[PDB]
Amino acid sequence: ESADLRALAKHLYDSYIKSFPLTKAKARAILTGKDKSPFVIYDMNSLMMGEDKISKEVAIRIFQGCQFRSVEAVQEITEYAKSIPGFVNLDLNDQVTLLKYGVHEIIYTMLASLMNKDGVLISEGQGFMTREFLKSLRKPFGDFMEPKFEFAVKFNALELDDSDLAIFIAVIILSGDRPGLLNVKPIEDIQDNLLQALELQLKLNHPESSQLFAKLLQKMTDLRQIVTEHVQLLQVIKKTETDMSLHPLLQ
Ligand SMILES: CCc1nc2c(C)cc(C)nc2n1[C@H]1CCc2cc(-c3ccccc3-c3nnn[nH]3)ccc21
């Protein structure tokens, strides 16, 4: 029944609110003037101003900020995954596998919520770092954030809300195509139910947006590429800057 799928949509929406302290709605209210206005970092000079509001050099301090935020996201996505009906019933190794790979794709989906064509919200929405400033960082650093902005600009064109994102990120975690997956079928049965709920949710929430379901699934291609490029750049920094490496979770 469709009434059963509506209950799954509400349950995923509630768990998303409980797990993610910074929603798209909060982020959009900050970015549009509705919630307090953020301090804008567009300069190396303006960066020093935001430090007393509220690692050696600028590009390195920003990089460790990204790594710190990545860990928090891993923690919050892990907490959310436990609530997906069927997730915790799966084999211990599979749970770990679905998270190990699925986490990178969720991070970039949810990071789009904090972005517009000209910048990104930082420090729990208190700040706003411009696209131009991030791009101007000394190489190889001033390269990593640019494709996330590229995906965000196009991903935000879908005009999704938090209730759509809750179901969409559930689909990501439950993908039966991960390396080292022992029992593929139980994962696919969960995903089938999730996709059914996502389909209904998009038809009810965006009734005028023709083929948004087909449009949303195609975006999974864009995610996989940004992950590859991120891992590729992560190796460069690991060899050039033999300093601070990945956090236990980040490893
Ligand atoms: C919400 C911010 C965020 N979450 C990220 C996740 C999940 C993944 C990746 C790859 N990057 C992430 N970022 C980037 C965007 C630009 C920026 C600036 C900073 C930053 C720069 C200078 C000073 C402070 C901060 C800061 N600290 N805490 N939040 N922002 C830290 C992080 C980041």
Cβ–Cβ < 8 Å for 29, 35: yes
Question: Domain count of the chain?
Answer: 1
- Comparing CA positions, the residue from 25, 3, 2, 26 lying closest to residue 163 is 25
| Residues spanned by the domain of 94 | 1-251
Tell me the residue type at 188.
E
Residue 94 CA to ligand 1 centre (angstroms): 29
Q: Atom 8 in ligand 1: which residue has the minimum CA distance?
A: 70
CATH of the domain at 229: 1.10.565.10
Pocket test for ligand 1, best of 109, 122, 128, 132 (most atoms within 8 A of CB): 122
Which residue is associated with the tokens 């904090």? Answer: 114
Q: Atom 32 in ligand 1: which residue has the minimum CA distance?
A: 66
Residue 62 tokens, joined: 């920003």
- Comparing CA positions, the residue from 162, 182, 165, 186 lying closest to residue 174 is 186
Q: Atom 31 in ligand 1: which residue has the minimum CA distance?
A: 65
Is 67 known to sit in a ligand binding site?
yes
Residue 188 tokens, joined: 């696919």
Q: What is the 3-state secondary structure (H, E, C) of 42-54?
A: CCHHHHHHHCCCC
Residues ≥6 apart with Cβ < 8 Å to 178: 97, 98, 100, 101, 102
Strands (E), 45-139: 115-116, 119-122, 127-130
Residue 151 tokens, joined: 């995906």
Experimental method of this PDB entry:
X-ray
